[PDB]
Enzyme design. Structure first.
Site, short mmCIF file in Angstrom:
data_model
loop_
_atom_site.label_atom_id
_atom_site.label_comp_id
_atom_site.label_asym_id
_atom_site.label_seq_id
_atom_site.Cartn_x
_atom_site.Cartn_y
_atom_site.Cartn_z
N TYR A 110 -24.58 38.58 55.25
CA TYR A 110 -24.53 37.76 56.47
C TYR A 110 -23.24 38.22 57.16
O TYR A 110 -22.86 39.37 57.02
CB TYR A 110 -24.63 36.23 56.15
CG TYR A 110 -25.04 35.38 57.34
CD1 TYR A 110 -26.24 35.61 58.01
CD2 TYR A 110 -24.23 34.35 57.84
CE1 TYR A 110 -26.61 34.86 59.16
CE2 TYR A 110 -24.61 33.60 58.97
CZ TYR A 110 -25.80 33.87 59.61
OH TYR A 110 -26.21 33.16 60.73
N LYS B 113 -54.80 34.40 50.00
CA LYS B 113 -54.80 35.80 50.42
C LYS B 113 -53.42 36.44 50.25
O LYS B 113 -53.33 37.61 49.87
CB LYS B 113 -55.23 35.98 51.88
CG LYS B 113 -56.09 37.21 52.14
CD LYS B 113 -57.54 36.80 52.36
CE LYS B 113 -58.49 37.93 52.01
NZ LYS B 113 -59.93 37.64 52.36
N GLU C 122 -57.63 37.00 59.69
CA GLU C 122 -58.44 36.43 58.67
C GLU C 122 -59.13 35.15 59.15
O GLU C 122 -58.49 34.30 59.75
CB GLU C 122 -57.52 36.07 57.54
CG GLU C 122 -58.26 35.83 56.25
CD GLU C 122 -58.83 37.11 55.67
OE1 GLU C 122 -58.08 38.12 55.61
OE2 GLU C 122 -60.02 37.06 55.28
N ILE D 12 -75.40 38.61 61.95
CA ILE D 12 -74.67 39.60 62.72
C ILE D 12 -73.48 38.92 63.35
O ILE D 12 -73.39 38.78 64.58
CB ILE D 12 -75.60 40.28 63.76
CG1 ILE D 12 -76.90 40.75 63.09
CG2 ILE D 12 -74.91 41.49 64.41
CD1 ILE D 12 -76.72 41.93 62.14
N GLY D 13 -72.59 38.48 62.46
CA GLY D 13 -71.30 37.94 62.82
C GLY D 13 -70.26 39.03 62.61
O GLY D 13 -70.55 40.22 62.78
N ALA D 14 -69.06 38.63 62.21
CA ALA D 14 -67.95 39.54 62.06
C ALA D 14 -68.32 40.66 61.14
O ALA D 14 -68.08 41.84 61.44
CB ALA D 14 -66.77 38.79 61.46
N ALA D 15 -68.90 40.30 60.02
CA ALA D 15 -69.26 41.26 59.01
C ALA D 15 -70.46 42.08 59.44
O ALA D 15 -70.41 43.32 59.46
CB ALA D 15 -69.55 40.56 57.70
N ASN E 35 -71.41 33.04 51.57
CA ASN E 35 -70.74 31.99 50.79
C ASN E 35 -71.84 30.98 50.38
O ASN E 35 -72.82 30.82 51.12
CB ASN E 35 -69.59 31.34 51.58
CG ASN E 35 -68.23 31.77 51.07
OD1 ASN E 35 -67.58 31.04 50.31
ND2 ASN E 35 -67.82 32.96 51.44
#
Lengths: 377, 377, 355, 377
Positions: free
Chosen positions: C33, C88, C130, C183-186, C266
């Site tokens: 410092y 995560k 995420e 057919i979303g994000a993935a 999921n």
């Protein structure tokens, strides 16, 4: 349904190690290992004191046991002892920031323990003996402290004595009686009791009546003496030359300090003690008398070894500070240091009947004990 | 530009401990210490194997030295050894995530060391003997590994032999010769040499010729036998019954493996060895011959102990994986397991003359060693 | 049998910080410092690249979510997302030694998220988006990766596509030579990877049926339209049952038997064993053949942050190949498990090397 | 020759993360990530307060700067700020065990900073604004503390004011003068000065005279009012309605508090102040007057911002305890909380001229401030 076992299983131990640095590259190794570490080796060989500058030795403590007296469980051995010494290590880190490391030995002959622990001196800044049975632990502590040049501390002896003494001093203040005039009965003269009687006498108590499982210790009927150490206690105790059982001892007594077995002090005996009688019933895990029962029978102040009740006399108030102080000092633990600790703990609160000493989570206590011990010769 | 000493002083040691939890309250202590920890004690006493589930024993290793042979510095003692063992502990954590802890002993008689280390068995899942001089370390290793039930590993013996073996196998592949048919000269029959000879034999070499400072080891020139261990080596060595100095040994030799002193192998002797001759000149810190000079004189492959040059044969490729595997398997380290490691290191790269083994920062190596050792147990 | 809640309670979080040194004295403070730290400040101001030498920036990653698409639970918000981002971060440290830290935002308008994350650039070496819902996460990913100069990666798009692709390649090998539902994000990104890899008959399906530009009902946004335009060969159309009839493969980000099955919703879609059918992949850390992001993000992030460049198609395909070559495929194990450390090393190596 | 730069480079950062558990297996993941974590996610979405039970939020703090006012360096930006905020984070951990994270923003418009930090509320238990310039930091602090439901603290404003106030109270005691009667000159009405003025008024001082670059702040000389905030100060200060430069202000003054520039207070001015004058010369890094020079010119008590000299008035005595108390209370930081801290610091020593406040390494201070803050409104 959150079990001690379940949580030990999930943690797979309470002891972590940890690195000073994250990335480890060619340069790092050249500094912390070869070839740079040679210079540090040369330096420490030329002068051992320099281990306190260049290694962790200035802050590492061995928690040593053979498991001959684990907690309340007895002589269960080094493997049973290991999770307990990990817990102590955790406490050392949490309350003193000391890096403690459990050393549980599969050797229980005295002389052999002594020579094993001596051999570890280079590796540690202090030794904490823990859960080693009496009477061997008397000789082991004496020898190691005399012969080693790092401090050696045995909780169940010196820790208990320190905290009992601070509690005693504050209860005595509340009692408003003179220390030279009080009759104090100490029951159960193993590791704690031996050392408690010695503290009480150094402090000023003149009438200490010692008792153990075959009655009041007395030269003259010496069926009262398991050991040589009880011999030594009767030499310096019982000025009125009393003889008989615990019940007889308590007649007129001002204090009972028990570090013995559960449910042995009958409530009606309290009424034969003196006025405003004080009861430290520290048998683990069941006290010598139930605390409420003792209150109901007239006790002025009641203390135990449990967190269940007020006035917990607990080694935890002592060992973090003492050990931290002693390891920094680097010398032998002395009577003056231990009595500084006693006084520090005692002044760390304003005594009341329901609170004659601080609790262990009061971090000021650990500070004050540390300071007291660091500053004393 | 930063000093090894300065950084050690700043770090005040390379060893940390660290706690599972941040906050420490009544509840946490009732689980990790009394009263909950009594359940854990009872379970471990009833069954010592359970220390592997409820304590850190599954991942703790003692790094044991008396300082009788520290790095290249010799018998400097346990204090000079400490910063080195701290360095080793660092490496164990960094490359294997093993919680290693230095145990530097102020005892150097071999029987006493043995009995000290034995007594530590309950507190560790593995023992790493380090920097203990020859010939006493032969007996120490043998005894502890026979009598203890956690793995014991001595780097300078078993690590060096493992890495040297893997190097030798790959060098032999590139040389295109039959193992039964090669003459291998091993010079310097100390900690490493002794074990290097035995591995080569286990591997399948038939003509091993051992050499030390009084010449080639041969039972019939008893001058050449400086202890019982040299005599043992002479008895399983030297099939052609050769006699004389290192120069004589090298006539027609395919490999020279030196773990001895600096600038001892004269360049012109290379020309008297066989075609495509291989030179492992591992003396630390000066090789038995300068590497460029050896290349110039006709060496087909040259390896040393330094990072300075291609082909660094270093224990670091071996001990992380071996120790991790062995502690996990909980068994004694076996010839099988060590040879698994040899093969895993050797197969960890595509050998060429300037790269006959991987570098130690190639983390695939440690995983492959670990996997190999885990799987042969 | 310890409860997830009870252990979270006892741990009081899965995130610790930790100090380089134990003792803290006058000298230590004068170095770390004031006043010593002023030299390091001056140096970093004069040259921001030096934060990679003098700070932890070289190894810190922000785990950014608004909680608009948490696990299988939907738009539960930033507070529900927090214990998940903590998880995560834990994984980031465990599997890549990356110091990751959760940034759960109480803002969900896309342009605002974008400018918040941009403003954090000086504090991190990488950004891991995420559990941000589609279709806003498509714009958010593209904008941030184009405008920031640290790598930005979104798991559910790029991670799931990587792992699904590796699984697919190994399953295909075992098959000895494709329906994508949700057919979303993935799903979006899975479709495009399969196309890049060489699949010709990809059939995309979502909640209004098989995506076909000629049945406009099936196009819930611009992105489904895009997919319909590069999917569906026999320009066929209808719901799933017709969608799936006599089917090379089924891949679901989702929620009858008769007609290789990556069912990765999921909980589950659609017997996940004893209803026949060759290869069966879950999302679960529960059953055989788990297709999970965990196999991808550690290595990809570690590689990308070290190379310091934007994440590329090449780097992601490196990863796909490294995961696929990380085991010998057998119907019951078409990819490795996440605690096989070899995988993360291989992914890391691959990504480093294509940077 | 050990450099701050060299050490930063070797550490590659002062911020580590660390994991609760060592081994990570299927079982661990199923608890700490999917599918177990879904129950914790559900719980926290249903009730955000449960983040304090199930995450680290109870003990994490964002250290937020745009680098518009770093140390004594000025507006160097977020990259220059980063190693400084890492240092602050390291302090937070060391003195309060708070897990602090640096958040250095590349945005410097005030409304934008405000909305960015608001958006971070779910991720932290507390916000520490640091090294954000005046006057924008006034609005930023006020808005965030008004609009957020976790405490928000800005050192340079609230910390400096707390510590200056405690120092002032103790100095005043030693002086033996009455607080409602002393003339106190505050020079440099930036982040600190503004707040110091307001605390002194709260505490009871009546004659506060504010001074900045264009002279004494006085509504009647509009030159003297560089923003709205200086106008605000002028309206609650200078009862005698004085006008002119610092030199004029100091005539008869009892205290000078400078939080401004170096070497501006000429020694002979001290002799025109009242008897037993007190000089807090806190400009960083060079004080408003050299401390020895000031003593030599007649100063009764001298304090600065440096560790180089006695009576270091430094923020470090305040922020650890304040933040820890506030984050645990979870509510907005209040005037009562900050004054408890003031009192706690002042009583944490027995004041003498060469020691009017404790030093930061006195751990009792941090405990006392924490207790004070935790206990108040």
């Amino acid at each position: 349904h959150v079990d001690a076992l379940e949580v030990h299983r999930f943690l797979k131990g309470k002891i972590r190690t940890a690195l000073p640095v994250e990335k480890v590259d060619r340069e790092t190794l050249s500094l912390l290992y070869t070839p740079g570490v040679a210079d540090v080796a040369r330096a420490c060989a030329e002068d051992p004191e320099k281990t306190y500058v260049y290694t962790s030795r200035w802050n590492t403590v061995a928690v040593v046991s053979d498991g001959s007296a684990v907690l309340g469980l007895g002589n269960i051995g080094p493997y049973g002892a290991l999770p307990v010494m990990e817990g102590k290590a955790f406490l050392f880190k949490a309350f003193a920031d000391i890096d403690a490391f459990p050393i549980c030995l599969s050797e229980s002959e005295e002389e052999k323990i002594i020579s094993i622990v001596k051999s570890l001196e280079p590796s540690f800044g202090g030794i904490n003996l823990e859960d080693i049975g009496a009477p061997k632990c008397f000789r082991i502590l004496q020898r190691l402290s005399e012969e080693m040049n790092i401090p050696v501390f045995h909780d169940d002896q010196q820790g208990t004595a320190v905290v009992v003494s601070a509690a005693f001093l504050n209860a005595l203040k509340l009692t408003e009686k003179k220390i030279e005039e009080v009759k104090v009965v100490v029951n159960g003269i193993g590791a704690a009791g031996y050392n408690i009687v010695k503290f009480l006498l150094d402090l000023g108590v003149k009438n200490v009546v010692a008792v153990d499982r075959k009655g009041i210790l007395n030269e003259n009927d010496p069926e009262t003496c398991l050991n040589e150490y009880h011999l030594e206690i009767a030499r310096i105790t019982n000025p009125e030359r009393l003889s008989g059982d615990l019940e007889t001892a308590l007649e007129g007594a001002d204090f009972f300090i028990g570090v013995s077995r559960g449910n042995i002090l009958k409530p009606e005996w309290i009424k034969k003690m003196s006025r405003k009688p004080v009861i430290f019933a520290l048998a683990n895990p069941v006290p010598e008398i139930d605390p409420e029962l003792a209150r109901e029978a007239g006790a002025f102040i009641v203390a135990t070894g449990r967190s269940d009740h007020p006035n917990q006399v607990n080694n935890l108030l002592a060992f973090p500070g003492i050990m931290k102080g002693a390891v920094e000092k680097r010398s032998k633990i002395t009577k003056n240091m231990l009595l500084s600790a006693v006084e520090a703990i005692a002044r760390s609160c304003e005594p009341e009947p329901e609170r004659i000493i601080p609790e262990a989570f009061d971090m000021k206590v650990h500070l004050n004990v540390y300071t007291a011990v660091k500053g004393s010769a």
